[PDB]
Amino acid sequence: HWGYGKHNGPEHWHKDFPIAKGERQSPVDIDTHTAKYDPSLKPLSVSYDQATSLRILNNGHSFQVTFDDSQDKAVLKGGPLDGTYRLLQFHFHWGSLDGQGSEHTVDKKKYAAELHLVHWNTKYGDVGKAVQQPDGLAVLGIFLKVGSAKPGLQKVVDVLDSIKTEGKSADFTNFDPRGLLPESLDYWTYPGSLTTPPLAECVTWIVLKEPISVSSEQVLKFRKLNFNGEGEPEELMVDNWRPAQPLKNRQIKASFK
Ligand SMILES: C[C@]12CC[C@H](OS(N)(=O)=O)CC1=CC[C@@H]1[C@@H]2CC[C@]2(C)C(=O)CC[C@@H]12
Ligand SMILES: [Zn+2]
């Protein structure tokens, strides 16, 4: 029922999901001059060597690549986190044009897209239990700008024609998400929420400062996806981003000076 359109988009979500107006909603604008360098923050530990990708899916609001999260094979630790978080899936948010698409903003700058790697805290045993906890999930966010191609994204790009419409899926084995990461793991962090319904306030956000570059041809393939199901009126899957929400009583911390 919810979506990104005039009649069902972000300004409507609070009717079905009243936490949309909560105290720790995401995304936010990252004011780089106000973010506090925290010398107590640890380097982020990203251990993706044993990742097992399974499927690629058009879920009607994004596409996602899903991983085997039945063991500690692709995990996030350290940084602001206590304990071990298993990679469940990654997905993107993007625009109709290159000047919008990201969910987080940096000094009000919007990037062309934003990559989210979604992880859940193994102390809660499954992701459904983790979304009911304030420290249940850790989402690693990476900005995309348009310039040079990202070679590690091309395998994703090339299968999108097979999942054009909602609920369509394909095998997507042996994909290495290390090929989507920038050089630096410098980050901002704050407590927030899922950025789609149910908008649960369960996420430690970790947003990398360094964007990756993707080519215009790569992001144009994102924009050929459809929000609609097969045979329904064709509505390009573009502008699937929630805008920045009020920071309220939160501090954004920087891992770097
Ligand atoms: C897929 C989605 C929503 C979109 C979120 O995107 S974002 N942008 O916040 O990372 C990532 C995310 C995490 C947990 C997942 C939830 C939808 C509902 C699920 C499946 C449950 O019922 C239990 C786990 C829940
Ligand atoms: Zn997301």
Swiss-Prot record:
GO terms for biological process: angiotensin-activated signaling pathway; carbon dioxide transport; morphogenesis of an epithelium; neuron cellular homeostasis; positive regulation of cellular pH reduction; positive regulation of dipeptide transmembrane transport; positive regulation of synaptic transmission, GABAergic; regulation of chloride transport. Changing residue 4 to H: Reduced proton transfer rate. It catalyses: hydrogencarbonate + H(+) = CO2 + H2O; urea = cyanamide + H2O. GO terms for molecular function: arylesterase activity; carbonate dehydratase activity; cyanamide hydratase activity; zinc ion binding. It is an enzyme of class 4 (lyase). Changing residue 198 to A: Normal CO(2) hydrase activity, but impaired stability. The active site is at residue 61. It comes from the Eukaryota. Interacts with SLC4A4. Interaction with SLC4A7 regulates SLC4A7 transporter activity. Interacts with SLC26A6 isoform 4 (via C-terminus cytoplasmic domain). Belongs to the alpha-carbonic anhydrase family. This is Carbonic anhydrase 2. It comes from Homo sapiens (Human).
